[PDB]
Design a protein around this ligand. Structure first.
Ligand SMILES: Nc1nc2c(ncn2[C@@H]2O[C@@H]3COP(=O)(O)O[C@H]4[C@@H](O)[C@H](n5cnc6c(=O)[nH]c(N)nc65)O[C@@H]4COP(=O)(O)O[C@H]3[C@H]2O)c(=O)[nH]1
Ligand SMILES: Nc1nc2c(ncn2[C@@H]2O[C@@H]3COP(=O)(O)O[C@H]4[C@@H](O)[C@H](n5cnc6c(=O)[nH]c(N)nc65)O[C@@H]4COP(=O)(O)O[C@H]3[C@H]2O)c(=O)[nH]1
Ligand SMILES: Nc1nc2c(ncn2[C@@H]2O[C@@H]3COP(=O)(O)O[C@H]4[C@@H](O)[C@H](n5cnc6c(=O)[nH]c(N)nc65)O[C@@H]4COP(=O)(O)O[C@H]3[C@H]2O)c(=O)[nH]1
Ligand SMILES: Nc1nc2c(ncn2[C@@H]2O[C@@H]3COP(=O)(O)O[C@H]4[C@@H](O)[C@H](n5cnc6c(=O)[nH]c(N)nc65)O[C@@H]4COP(=O)(O)O[C@H]3[C@H]2O)c(=O)[nH]1
Lengths: 73, 79
């Protein structure tokens, strides 16, 4: 199920909560030279990486991304 | 050292030589829904995959793609 991230909502999620997601997204945009401001799709196994970054389980990370509306159900 | 395949050029290579590469590209394009039909950039690690499909070393495989005009000569530095 596509990990397609809304960078708009991402940009307005409280940092307190979303700073590591934003910095991860940013290193991918930089690697890619992909600077569109709207959407970032990322690899399925990048979910596992973000989960480590947040020290959460994938499933928890997922629910939290949905809740900020950065990912869709 | 980007691996960028030239699709127009690929389509001209005879199937008995380039067929496994053409099916690989079409499989990636399908997986992506990417039908620009001009260029296909692929992962560094996908060189390994094509080399396995061709039963060639990565060096041999890359030389072949350059000879077909499908990879620019850059790609040498990827192995
Ligand atoms: N997931 C995703 N990422 C996207 C999309 N559009 C653009 N990008 C990203 O944005 C970078 C720059 O895109 P571009 O310069 O406007 O424009 C491109 C594009 O015109 C062309 N290009 C190179 N390779 C490919 C390819 O495999 N497919 C397509 N459709 N275009 C490519 O070369 C430039 C740079 O390509 P890249 O190195 O791939 O780098 C791309 C890629 O990382 C998209 O629809 N989905
Ligand atoms: N810049 C960017 N746009 C994104 C991203 N995710 C989704 N999109 C948008 O959603 C469509 C499909 O993205 P996709 O699943 O990456 O699937 C894309 C992707 O696989 C590929 N693609 C398009 N442009 C590029 C490119 O510049 N470089 C590469 N490497 N692939 C590309 O073509 C497929 C279809 O592209 P489109 O339908 O025309 O247009 C896109 C694009 O408008 C993203 O991370 N970055
Ligand atoms: N080995 C290999 N497999 C490929 C390739 N292109 C597509 N696939 C497979 O096709 C899936 C969908 O690709 P996408 O629609 O462009 O959907 C892509 C896409 O938009 C984006 N994406 C992943 N990696 C890159 C990348 O290196 N550059 C760019 N610009 N976008 C990426 O995240 C998505 C989800 O990625 P995955 O979960 O890996 O999901 C990928 C992957 O399993 C390829 O060049 N090589
Ligand atoms: N549409 C589509 N294109 C794909 C996909 N996978 C690879 N590509 C294309 O192949 C190029 C090289 O992929 P790479 O060697 O994995 O080299 C990639 C890679 O190591 C890293 N990277 C980019 N996006 C992602 C991502 O979403 N996840 C991860 N884990 N790494 C990424 O940055 C490098 C440069 O990325 P780009 O300049 O976009 O350059 C990408 C791109 O144009 C895919 O799944 N979908």
């Amino acid at each position: 199920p596509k990990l397609v991230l809304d960078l708009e909502r991402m940009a307005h999620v409280p940092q307190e909560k979303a700073g590591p997601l934003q910095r991860y997204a940013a290193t991918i945009q930089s690697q890619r030279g992909d600077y569109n401001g709207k959407v970032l799709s990322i690899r399925q196994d990048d979910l596992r990486t973000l989960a480590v970054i947040y020290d959460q389980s994938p499933s928890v990370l997922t629910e939290q991304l949905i809740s900020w509306g950065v990912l869709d159900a």
